[model samples]
Structure formats: C-alpha cells, structure tokens
Target chain A: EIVLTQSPATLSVSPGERATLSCRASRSVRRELAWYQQKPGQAPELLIYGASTRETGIPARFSGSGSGTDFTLTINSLEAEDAATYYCQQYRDPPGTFGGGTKVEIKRTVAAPSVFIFPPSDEQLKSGTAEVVCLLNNFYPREAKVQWKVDNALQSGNSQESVTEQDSKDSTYSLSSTLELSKADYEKHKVYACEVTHQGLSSPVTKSFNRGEC
Target chain B: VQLVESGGGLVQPGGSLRLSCAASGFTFSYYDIQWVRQAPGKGLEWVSSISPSGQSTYYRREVKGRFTISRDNSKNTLYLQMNSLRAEDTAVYYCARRTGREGGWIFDYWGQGTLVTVSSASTKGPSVFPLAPCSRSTSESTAALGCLVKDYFPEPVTVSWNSGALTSGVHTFPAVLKSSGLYSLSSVVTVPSSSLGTQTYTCNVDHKPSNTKVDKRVE
Candidate 1:
C-alpha cells in the first residue's frame, strides 16, 4: 500500500492570506493526486484533482502544485470557509491512499436555505412535457446546489440553477432550479423531489412533490 | 418579526414525523431559521438549521442522520422532518430566526413551539394471524400452511412447526422492516393436502429479540 503523509497537522492563517500544506508520498504517484476539503460533521468535498486542476466553481485562490513524492496544496487570499481540514489522495494504482489530513485554521466564521417546489401547469402535465420549479431564498455565500430526483432516479445532465435575486438589505442570495420531464413520467404515481445543499448546513434538505397528495 | 409553529401530534416509537414553522411581518429574505427541541424535563437542544434561501441546512452532531431541516421561502415557512423516532425524541420543538447587528448575533425572533410525543413501549410484541389457505397454484404438492407476524421489534423472529424440524416444504422468510421502523414476517410450512383432517397444526413464534414466547393454533 502506498502511504501518503501530510505535514503541518495544522496551519494557522489569517483571512485573505496565503496558506500552503504539504503531502509526501511513500513513492512517486505521478500527477494522480487529489485534494479535498472537509468541515465538521460534513463529508469531504473535492477541491483539486489531477494534482493541480481545480474542480468547477472552486475559487481561483485554491491551487495545487508539485508531483512525485512531494505535493503541495496552496490557497491564496483564503476566506473564512477555507478553514477546514484538507486531505490528499493518490489513485495512480490499486488501493488509492489518503493522507493523514491537514487542518487549516482561519481567524473566523455564516446562513441557511429555504426550499419550495411548484408543480407543473395542468396543460404542461397533460400532453406536453411537465416542468416543476424549486425556489430558494435568503441563503448567503452565493453558492448552493439544487437537483431533482424522481423516486429513486436522480435527474441527469448539467442541471441549471441561476440566481433569482440578492436582497440588498441583508445581502442574502436566491436561486431556482427546474426539472422538465415527459408527461407520462410525471403522471406516474411517484414522488418528484428537489434536494438542496449549502455551506451553512451539514446535510441536504429534500422537498417532495406529489400530485396525488394535492 | 414573529414566528408560528405547526401543531404537533403523537408518533409511535420507530415511526416518523414532520413539523412546520411559519413566519410573518418580516422580510422573508435575510435571516437564518434554527430548530430547537426540548424533551420532557430536559434542557433545550439545538436540532438543526436552514438558511433564508431554503437551499442549505446544518445540524448538530447528535441528530444528523434522522433529522432534516428545510424552508419554504415563497410561503415564509420552515420544516423539520425526522424519521425512526425513539422515545427520547418526544419533545417540544421550536423555530427561531437568527439575526445580528451592532448588538450581537442571536435568535432575534421566536415561535411558540409545538409538542410531539413518542411512547416507550415495553412489550409491544408481534400480532399473529392465521396463514392464508393452502394454494394449489404451485406444484409443491399440498398444504401451504403459515403464520403472518406483524409489528414486531428486535427483528429476526424465530418460528417452529409443533417443534418439528423440517427443511423442505417449510419456508420461513426473513423479516421485513416497514416505514414505521418495525418489522414483519411470514413463516410457511407445507403439508400434504390429503392429510388435511389428520392432526392439529400449531405455530409457535419465539420473539427472540424480546425473549417473548407466543403460540398460535389453527382449528
């Protein structure tokens, strides 16, 4: 088993400053390194893959460098949310290994979300495809994910969720997501649900829609 | 500015419940709503939280898996759904909005809260019913004798046919966990149809989990 050891068990950094953490592998794992960030009571979120490529929506401040035995994950101009435990993993071969983990401490600290679902119109449910909308409001951080799941099946493809409004008075963000499916699929005696995730919460909140219940 | 919680009701242990909190007289756009619950004679505990957008949620360590918090921004409402309720889950749940200014961050607004209860059933054993009549559909020969066991706890209930140990023609299916968190099962033992009027048939169920002994005899 190729073991990955991360250094500086903890790194203390002030807001808007640069912080770098190191990971040393037992042997050369090439550029197959991955970086993840995890908060308390939450699952680790992928940040950097392929050793240096940042995942989509990740801030430009987050970057990765180095390969082979020594690897480095650097965060420039860090934000409060950046205060989390970071880990490194290698997948070049069998039994991909994960590093011990490096906890990043920031000087500080955040919002919740509301989820509402609106069913499709009668006409839309008849012959044409049915489209249902999920609205969110008052969440901060301007970042959230909304997805649709019909019963056990989750909607596929690059789902769309755009900002609806940002309250200027308190500076909260709002957005909405919709799922359009065939009328036949929508009419089945099944449940269509909208699930949401945000930084403020540890788990996703799911709201279910059932025409028969209405 | 004000909060109103939905009425709560009784839920059996192992069941589930959903509660709501509606707010008015405030801009439905900027505050964080939090859920707090208090069991009988116990201190208040922070259950979970949701943001203004109704898009995100957070929870305390003790109650993460079975608890969920969400909101309805359009209707200015908040919801808390919990499953696999236990006796300890009986409590009065409240929802309050969190706000901060020069004064400090705190729950600036509050709701009256609602009461929900769960009973600690000591010996709510399984209810036994006579098995369906022998079906001649399958070519398995004759009698399809069995027992229907419902609402049993501490699963993996055991059954015996007049203490007669036989593998073939005797089918005892595994337990079925219902939505209420309880278990149900059916045990089938087949006998020849020609021997219908022969001897008496008695089904013995051992509530293995609870150590309870029960017997059901068919006339």
Candidate 2:
C-alpha cells in the first residue's frame, strides 16, 4: 500500500482556537481516511472515519472532510482535554497503515532549530590551524547550549564563545558557536561534531564535519 | 459486541493452521471481519479481512500466497487459514468487526486475541543481493562510501564496516520493510581521502537464520 504522509508534524494551539490537521496519501485512498485521538497513556479513540463520518459519541467539534488523497480533520474549538496526539489511517487499502502522528500540544508557538557547520577557511587551514563555525538559527526560547566533539568523544578546546541573537519580529533566537583547532589536531581528529541543546527541544541538534568538507 | 477466536495454539511448520472467531451481539452479518496479528512484544499487523456477505476478501501482500480468509454468514463467524507456516509465524491473532462508512469499513470492535505458534523452521531464506552498487563521492580531502543490502528474511541481521584505523562518521540507517515482507538496509562511512589508497572499506553482513555472511568491499 502507498504511504500516508501527515503535515505540520506538531501543532500547538491554545484552548478555544480552531485546529486543523492534514493527512495526504501517496496514492488515492478513495474516501477511507480515519482520524483517531490518543491521550497520554491511553488507547487511541476513533474520532472520524471514512473521510467525514464521526464515530459514535464523538463531539460535534471533531469534524472530518475531503476525499481521494487529500483529507483533513478539524477541531472547531480546542479544549484542555484535547491536548493529545492524533493519527490518520486508511482502510480503503489493505495492509492498512497509519500516517506519522501529529502531536497537538497545549502551549505557545515553539520553533525547532536548523543547524549548519561551516568548513575552515583556506587561509586558516594554511596557517597550520583550522577554525570551524557551527550556526543554529530560527529556534525559539533563546536558551541553548553547544558542545563540541572530536570523532565520538567529547572535546575541550579553544572554542569561540556562543552567540545568541533574537529575531525582532518572531522573538525567536538564532545561535552560533565556533570551534578552533590546530592543523595537527585537525589531522588527528578528522571528524568534528557540534551538538546543540535548547530548552524547547527534547533532544540535542547534532551536525558533524570532515576535515576539509562542508 | 463480543468476539471469540477459536483454534489450536500449536501448529507444525508446513502444516495448515485454521482459526475461527465467533461474534455475538448486534447484527454480526452487517459488518466485515478483520484478522490481525501481533508477534510477541511486536506491533500490530493486518493479516486479512473478509466481507460480511463473504464475497470480498483482502490480504496483506506479505501473507497473500500462504493465507486464506473466509466467513460463515449463518454462524456469524470469521475464519483464517494458513499453509506452510514457519517459526516466525508465531503470533497472537485477533478478529474485529468493521464499521462500514455510510454503512463502507473500519475496525470498530475487536475480539480478545488467540495465540498461534508455528514451531520449527520450514521457510526459505531470502535471496540476498545488493540493492544498489556502492557509490563513491570524493572531495579534495574527504570521501564517502555507501551501499544498500536487500532481501533478508526473519529479521535480526547485523551490518558492520570493516576498514583499518579510521572509525569516525560510520553510520547504518535502520532497516526498512518491503511490500514482499523482506528487509532492506543501507550503511555509509566517511573517511579521509589519504586513507582511500591505503585500505579498502568492506560492508560485512551477518544473517543468523540462514547461517550466512557476506562481505562487500569498496575502494
């Protein structure tokens, strides 16, 4: 069967606001879209099935609509109890498969980080030393830490202090940290990694680099 | 609604295994019945389903050739039959009454599951081959070597890199399940260009069930 891809991976909405979730099938699933809600530590409860039919006893706000490959699930007004994960399944096809879950959280907008590692400049490498910069941008909360690693082991070296800059419009933070090494160090440890941990992130962001490649 | 699955809990490999789930409460003849399985501690998998009127049946590609799905309209019961079973076929099977849309199909009510264990090994080992030839990407100072291995069966295979000295940036992506029920995996490792001429990188694979080992090397 074709895969079902869900969008917006995570949706953060306050109570009383409308929340719309999407599920797109790789191929036409006809009208077999099924939506389900799963609360913390509980089994999934069917909300909508066959594209738009509400399951028995489901509230009016939990609505579903659409056909073919594009289907949607809309909650008219979110409630505190609606904070949970939602999934979309297709039954029109056999070997039924589910889309990656979309987590509906009760919180403000939180942004994830896009990380990058820049290679050492030619001049810096020619001087028997290397300086690589790790840039983390478009992340929320303004609080993050960057740790450097040589190969897979932690490394303590001359790293330029991290910088955190806030976007005036979105109030999100953009962070950057730089790591420096001698030519001897670069040759000995061909792989360098920069890991970023943010308050809003559950896990750290990691990016590795080879000696001279980006 | 209530569902009760009936069948023997033990079956020998290559032997046929039959199971039945009887339904009670509501109009059982109005809904389709689905057969699902869970291999000990594993996730749920759809085995097959039979229409309420016993006209239509759907099977997962994985079990299509070896399994049969049927239903009895008079007894309000669903049946599952498997042929030439293997050790890996052991699992807890369940039956569920499907709720049709507008009156089409969703698994709304499920029955308590019954266990079926396929003892011994009668299944054939997969036809293992390189899904893709090893690819090389080289730069002035660094290079990457990557390849894919496909068609390994019954799960639990190990793939490792065997190159002297250099050990950083070696990674193996998780195996993926194909429609044919076999597995495919990919591995990649980065090395300094200087080491390219000195040593070769080998992709070593170990499959315990087939008692086989394959080593593919790339320069």
Candidate 3:
C-alpha cells in the first residue's frame, strides 16, 4: 500500500484565516485521493474526494488541489469549528492508507506539556530491543508534536503514538509515544530524545533519556 | 513499538502461504491486528483483522473464505494464512496495528511487509547503486550526483535528494522498463561545489510496490 505523509502535524491558525494542509504520497496517486474532516467524538466526515471535489453539501470555502503525488487541502477563512483534525487518503491502490491526521487548532493560549521519558526496563531489554516511552502530560488544546531522535537523527516509521487523552476535570491533554530500537543502540549509549513542539510553550521541549537509567 | 514480519519468498501460484508478524513494546492481544495487501500497481486491499482477544474477526469479501487471522497473546505474534494464492496475490502483505475510533479506525503502526510473489523469477525490491559523478553542470563550482535504482518490479517509484534539503537542481528520470520485466530509474541532484566540500549529498529512492527505501550517499 502507498504511504501517505501529511506535513505540519498541527496548524495553529486564527479564526477567519486560511489553513493549507499538504499530503504527499510515496508514489504518484494520480487523482485518486480524498480528504476527510474529523472532530472529537465523531466519525470522519468526507470533506473532499477525487483529489479536489468537495462532497455534497460542503461549503465552497473548502478546496483541494494538486495531483499525482502531492496534494493540498485548503480551508478558506477557517472557522471556530474548523479546529479539528483532517486526514488525506489514497484509494488508487489496494489497501488504502490514511495520512497521520493533522490537528488544526484555532489560535488560543494553552498550557505547555510536562514532558517525561522512560527508559526500557531490564526485563523488557532482555527481549533484545529497547522500547522507550515519551509522555507529554497536562497540555491544553490537544495540539502537540513529538519526534523521536537517536543521536540527533530523526527516526521515522518505527514509532507509534497514542491518541491524546483529555482530562475530564480540567480538559488538559496527555499523550504517550513509544519508539523501538535495537537494544544494541541503547547499550552503545546513544542519546535518545523526545522533541515536543506545542503551542503552549515559547519553544519546543527536549527531553533526553540516559540509557543508564534503565 | 516494533513489528517484524516473517515468511517472505517467491512462492508458486495455487500454493498456500502463512505469514507471521512478531510484535513488541506492548500487550499484543490488547488491540486489533489488521492485515492488508495490494496487487502490483493496485490500491490498498483490506484483507482481514483479528481482535485483541481473538474473539472478533472481520474480513473483506475477497479473501474471507480462505484465510486465517489469529493472534497468540503469549508469543506476541499474529498469523495470516492465505490458501490458493493466485497471480493477483503477487503483492506485499502488511500486518498493522488498527487503532482509533470504531468507524474511523487508524493504522497507527506498520510492519515492514513481507513480499510474496507467485513468480520464482527475480521479483525483488530496488537496490541503490553507489552515487556517481554525473554529467557536468554550467558552473565548475557545482557537481551533479547521480543515483541508480534498479531491479524493482512494479514501476512506481520516487527518487529524491537532499543535502540539507537542497530542493533546486534535481531531476528524477522516468523509470525505464527492462527486458527481464523489472524496472530501473535514476536521479541527478546538483550540489554546489562550496557545500560539496562541507556537505554530503544523499539520494532517497523508494519503490512503491515493494514498500522499500534505499539510499545512496556521495561525498
């Protein structure tokens, strides 16, 4: 199946502004792409299909463009309700795949996440692989990004992210991401970092775990 | 989390194949495990899925009757068995972690798929040949690096380069079909002589049908 990658994991645009989202296919998908708009507690709703065609009863402000491998989903004059997640998918091939959905948040002040990193346990390390966990807790607005890096090189396609959980008491969000690597890399004392980008903070947060901590 | 798949080979048509996906980093039987595949140059086909406890199972009509989707909680492995494979089954099979909401499930994690071709011929993924000096450019201070991606079935591919995201002066030629029925493609990226002394250029080659990526680096 073709892998579809979406850029700008989170978009922080003010209301009445424009949001341009990009989805690039690993290969040419022709015009067989679609976009869906999703909100919390709701199923994904078809926003655009056939690359750029808006679905029935859709607003004219929502538009899609580009062809082949690169496509864009534009939301014109973004509204308050537009502060949701969007996903792009390719159906031109068998076993369709959706891009990691992009969260669009209307500009608002939020609380920075408390970042934490957990090294692999001794028992888990006995499995011949190192599984590291990065936890981001007590964040607001649900717009946070995490990138796992090994010795300054960004790692991809080897990690899984849990859905952000919202605290019922205060609505603050919590997220967890796990990255797996060969235990040898850990034994080699490679620096593993969790780079967290959030609108709440003035800058991205960096949390590194020491292998010796395990 | 990491997922490694096993049982990859060029098997004969009309034969049965069993694929295994070994998982780590979490409880294997706590989430749904999905199976999917694609024909050569075709779109995604959802094969089937087995729920965490192995109680619930779902399938697409195409491979419903002749398949087994099960999970071994203790072993942290999921198995997929397909019977009576045909030429159309000549595709890469993937086992994925199915997460998210009920109607909007997301495949958050994926395994490096196992290629199962029905042909015993040289059906394989592309390999990146070493980067070579390409035909010269206008400026003597600039050098062109060429990378060859060869021996790949299924013509779909993307060739790209970056020496600190050097976006300009790069061209990927269309894939050329070979007499042996495989395909090869090449890409050329221009590196400024100034940065060539300081930066190492890398070529990224990805073969679609194989779901594989190989890279070639230059000085």
TM-score of chain A of each: 0.50, 0.52, 0.53
Q: lDDT tens digits, residues A143-183, model 1?
A: 78887887868788624444522332334555656474556
- TM-scores of the candidates are 0.28, 0.43, 0.43
Q: Please name the candidate that would achieve the greatest lDDT relative to the true structure.
A: 3
Model 3, range A1-214, lDDT digits (tens) per residue?
5889888878877667889999999999898787877654333466787788887778998999999999999999977677667888886764367787788777544778766565654544564545666666667767678999988889898775654323323345566566756778678766788999998888898877556543
Question: Where is model 1 more than 4 Å wrong at Cα?
Answer: A1-214, B100-105, B120-219
For model 2, give the TM-score of chain B. 0.53
What residue pairs clash in candidate 2, if any at all? B100-B104, B101-B104
Kindly list the per-residue Cα lDDT of model 2 for residues A1-28, writing each as its tens digit: 6687889878866657899999999989
| Lowest-sum lDDT 10-residue window in model 3 chain A | A163-172
The whole-model lDDT of each prediction reads 0.67, 0.68, 0.70
| Residues B33-107 of candidate 3: C-alpha lDDT, one tens digit per residue | 888675543434568888889998887776777778888999999998888877777777778775533233445
lDDT of 1 by residue, B1-219 (tens): 668887466677888889998889987667778886756534345578777787767776667898888777889888888888887878778786655332222343557677776755444468666543312234334554556565776444668777765444444555555556676665655567666577567778887545667787743
Q: How much lDDT does candidate 1 score?
A: 0.67
